[PDB]
Symmetry: C2
Subunit: 347 residues, 2 copies
């Protein structure tokens, strides 16, 4: 029973009154009410694993900012490797390094092994009461694989890439199991009530053009081929986002997903020319703009709207997550600007 669905409409190239906006990490430490809930939870994993708390932080930006046109599931990108028994605490107690390691990895069952995520989705979907669509998400196979091979956050992905060039056979094995896992994970979230899904390929941008095709994109394509594309009588749009992936939009546009995420390095007008006929686009403002005065924030919104131009097919967002020191009022000025200034570009 969706009351506001312009976010979905834009992704599906349907007419809209204004350009929709949401923001990566809109539930995060820049919000004092998030910091309160996080302290109430006690630690970050408790917040993630408690569906009531995950819901609480998910709703917080929506209640603060009526301009936001979508909710995104609050969770950790690393749920799946954690579930595989790798012991997430940002590092892993168990680290992938041999083919033998990978073969032993189980493919997590969404409801039996990741039930708390599924519970969070159901809880959020209920509590939203149709106010805005709910976005489910997961990290990409390549991105999750690097976390599992690096053993956590990495200096420069030397180990992950070395293993890629030395033992591509083992890396294929790992990526394939992760593709399997991500597919069922997202399908789980969709069954639980997610109305769109986004794949975050956060580290795909560090790959060479060739390695990106073989070791990241091919596995996102596998996932999209396995996703539930319709639920609750509506299409469930898929958004692929490779940060730093602007060079590669053309191939990304042929995977069959509805939309591609963009970061600020890619001119969105150029992106629309290159692949606009095949996908919706989401993005792409540099988050650092939010540290500037409201006039500058408005000016940058106007520039980006002008670059995209007239008509549907754009969802406004940043090109990366907001950072903890941003003034919530500057975030608000951003969302307001998108709705106020974009109206002229529709109709």
């Amino acid at each position: 029973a969706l009351k506001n669905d312009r976010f979905l409409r834009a992704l599906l190239k349907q007419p809209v009154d204004v350009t929709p906006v949401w923001m990566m990490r809109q539930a995060g430490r820049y919000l004092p009410e998030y910091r309160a809930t996080r302290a109430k939870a006690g630690d970050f994993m408790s917040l993630c694993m408690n569906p009531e708390l995950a819901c609480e932080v998910t709703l917080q930006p929506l209640d603060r900012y009526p301009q936001l046109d979508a909710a995104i599931l609050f969770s950790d990108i690393l749920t799946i490797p954690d579930a595989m028994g790798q012991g997430l605490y940002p590092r892993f107690r168990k680290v992938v390094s041999s083919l033998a390691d990978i073969e032993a990895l189980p493919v997590p069952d969404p409801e039996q092994d990741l039930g708390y995520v599924m519970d969070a989705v159901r809880t959020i979907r209920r509590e939203l009461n149709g106010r805005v669509p709910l976005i489910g998400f997961s990290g990409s196979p390549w991105t999750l694989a690097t976390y599992m091979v690096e053993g956590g956050s990495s200096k420069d992905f030397r180990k992950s890439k070395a293993m890629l060039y030395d033992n591509p056979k083992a890396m294929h094995a790992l990526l394939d199991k992760l593709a399997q896992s991500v597919t069922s994970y997202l399908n789980g979230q969709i069954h639980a009530g997610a109305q769109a899904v986004q794949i975050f390929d956060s580290w795909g941008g560090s790959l060479s053009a060739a390695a990106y095709q073989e070791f990241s994109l091919a596995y996102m394509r596998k996932i999209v081929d396995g996703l539930i594309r319709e639920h609750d009588g509506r299409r469930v749009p898929v958004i692929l986002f490779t940060k730093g992936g602007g060079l590669w939009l053309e191939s990304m546009a042929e995977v069959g997903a509805e939309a591609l995420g963009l970061d600020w390095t890619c001119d969105i007008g150029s992106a629309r020319a290159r692949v606009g006929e095949r996908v919706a686009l989401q993005g792409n403002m540099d988050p650092s703009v939010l540290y500037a005065n409201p006039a500058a924030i408005r000016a940058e919104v106007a520039r980006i709207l002008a670059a995209y131009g007239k008509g549907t097919g754009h969802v406004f967002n940043l090109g990366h997550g907001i950072t903890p020191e941003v003034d919530p009022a500057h975030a608000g000025a951003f969302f307001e600007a998108v709705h106020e200034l974009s109206a002229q570009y529709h109709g």
Copy 2:
């Protein structure tokens, strides 16, 4: 016209016929070489090494002696030379990295900054160029270099290394008038610095726009590329009877090659995220291309290194206009033998793409 024994590097940059694809490597003088680390220890630190022309020459020549395949030398020097000469007080915080005592935050700060004179105020750099040019004895061309105005500006506004560049970009959006004033002054400075290096014997120059890739497409045009264009227009174009090729390198700038190619510089540097075949199709008629291998490949076994060299050569295809390099600097933990396999693969495997 002064003598070179090997000039295939220059010829590739100028789209002239070459026998093999030339190769050199960013940071080819650096901590991955044990002889470098020994010289650096004898100097005490990096800064002392940069400010002693005899030792800067010594490390500049080391990779050439170890690796006969290398087709160019690059001036060993500090990217932060100019803002130090400007008076901002470069030092090294024990646990972090280079920092400046003084940080740029206002138009008034910027107006006060002087434009260093290369020979009068950076004589130790010009001496290094002269010394290297002499000691090379024409074995390979010498590359001079500088940071770009945008890249230098970020160090001066942040006051050292930064992860997110929040302060630099905040100033870009909040105080464009001041940020442009800084960029303008730095372009003038970089121009005379590079020209001093050329007059001292540099035979090519590379502008390292290391942090230009963090800019939006729109901001890149106004706050970085426009100032590299200023520099290129002001550079000495010929010296010692030769054209002096200019290489512009914005790491992560692959989306922007078309505009970079309109500046008038001979060549553009690429990183591994850009398919070099695609790059050649997009701008190869206008510029030579340098790059573009992922430095991380050098951690892999030599067979993998050769296969990746082979792939990149196949992607560029037949004919001049390519200088092989990494897309980034080599890191200290790469085995010298792996770097060696790399250079040997480029010369051996590229022969078939020429003639």
